[PDB]
């Protein structure tokens, strides 16, 4: 309710209690939804005073009020977070992590999560100021359940921001130091802790195979497959993103997901009413069908081919594009028998209907798949049989009409098939 000018008068007074009320009043201003006047605050020069109040051990209320005020400034645009870091806030908040007052160390956790959240450079600067050790020491209890729920969720969220962002990814040793506490939060029974722990693991598996390995080595894949089955969307979404990332790795890393039971969840995932879940599940499936023949066989055995035919036939267009990738990866690496099977499941007609989409990328993918499938057919003498099938469902009209397509890759490929097999 105070004007900024009054808060400035209060803060510049020489009177700690007057500075306290004025800081509280700033906190309340900055605590309202409809555009808190952050820039006004910054422009009055208040950040350096808030930061020096962070160090007032004798006046824990002004530590709390200023922590909160700065939390909210640091929650704004990059320029606003930078004004907080530029005021010296980072080591001051890290020292508040050891405060005996739980509400004050929690406010310091939160503020550091906002600063780390702005991007790679500030995340790495938080880390270089030594935030990780006193953060992890707040969770060094025998049973996470004895911590206050809100307090535990804030910690988990700030730790997930320390795992987030990519160019560069977090330092390898900081990831190693954080991982065991993260594996433990991933077994915790609060849905928001679980969601954010899963997000963190999704960020850490989003990168080169060496990064995936450090996570998989910690034996989290079975817990991730279990979370894949949760009823809470906010948990399924990151658990599936993490699983999808792990199967972009090596064949051995892909195999840990299959052995953990993940494929049995895909009938639901591939039909999930949330379109982003269907899209990410089909993308994951495309990377599994880019696997070894024995892994492709597991996809067969789990009955997932008819589910791929399903999403190819009807899904959001972005999912259908993933289904087309899953098919052309399957047909490039599968045995003749796995490829025949795919056709017996009814792949050909939805594949041909997608030759009508005005998306140049999907067209090449589908044409590569057809080529692969003809390839298997030749190996069996069936080119003819397959060729009529393609014709009867109207697929020859599509391949033919694609030679009037001013993408050279497209109508080169079409022409190629239009003679070679027709």
């Amino acid at each position: 309710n105070w004007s900024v000018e009054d808060i400035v008068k209060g803060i510049n007074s020489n009177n700690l209690e007057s500075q306290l009320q004025a800081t509280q009043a700033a906190r309340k201003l900055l605590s309202r939804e409809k555009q808190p006047p952050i820039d006004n605050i910054i422009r009055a020069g208040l950040i350096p005073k808030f930061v020096s109040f962070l160090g007032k051990t004798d006046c824990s209320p002004i530590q709390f009020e200023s922590a909160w005020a700065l939390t909210n400034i640091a929650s704004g645009t990059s320029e606003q977070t930078k004004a907080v870091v530029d005021g010296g806030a980072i080591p001051a908040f890290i020292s508040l992590l050891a405060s005996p007052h739980a509400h004050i160390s929690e406010q310091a956790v939160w503020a550091l999560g906002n600063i780390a959240g702005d991007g790679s450079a500030f995340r790495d600067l938080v880390i270089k100021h030594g935030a990780i050790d006193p953060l992890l020491a707040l969770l060094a209890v025998p049973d996470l359940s004895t911590l206050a729920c809100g307090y535990l969720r804030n910690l988990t969220w700030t730790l997930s921001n320390l795992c987030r962002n990519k160019n560069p990814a977090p330092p390898l040793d900081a990831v190693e130091q954080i991982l065991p506490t993260l594996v433990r939060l991933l077994h915790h029974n609060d849905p928001e802790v679980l969601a954010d722990s899963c997000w963190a693991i999704s960020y850490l598996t989003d990168g080169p195979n060496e990064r995936i390995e450090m996570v998989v080595k910690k034996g989290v894949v079975p817990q991730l497959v279990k979370l894949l089955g949760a009823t809470e969307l906010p948990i399924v979404t990151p658990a599936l993103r993490a699983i999808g990332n792990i199967v972009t790795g090596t064949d051995e890393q892909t195999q840990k997901v299959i052995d953990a039971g993940a494929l049995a969840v895909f009938p639901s995932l591939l039909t999930n009413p949330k379109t982003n879940i269907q899209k990410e599940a089909t993308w994951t499936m495309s990377n599994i069908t880019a696997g070894r023949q024995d892994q492709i066989q597991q996809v067969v055995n789990h009955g997932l081919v008819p589910f791929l035919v399903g999403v190819l036939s009807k899904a959001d267009f972005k999912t259908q594009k993933e289904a087309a990738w899953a098919i052309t990866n399957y047909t490039s690496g599968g045995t003749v028998e796995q490829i025949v099977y795919l056709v017996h499941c009814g792949i050909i007609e939805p594949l041909m209907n997608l030759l009508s989409a005005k998306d140049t990328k999907i067209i090449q993918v589908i044409l590569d798949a057809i080529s692969n499938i003809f390839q298997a057919a030749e190996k069996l003498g069936e080119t003819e049989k397959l060729s009529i099938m393609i014709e009867e469902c109207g697929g020859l009209d599509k391949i033919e009409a694609l030679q009037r397509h001013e993408n050279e890759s497209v109508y080169k490929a079409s022409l190629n098939l239009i003679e070679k097999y027709f």
Partner: peptide
């Protein structure tokens, strides 16, 4: 052929 939650949060009133 493999193919590879909220950044910042204000504390509201309270």
């Amino acid at each position: 052929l493999k193919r590879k939650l909220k950044l910042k949060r204000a504390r509201l009133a309270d």
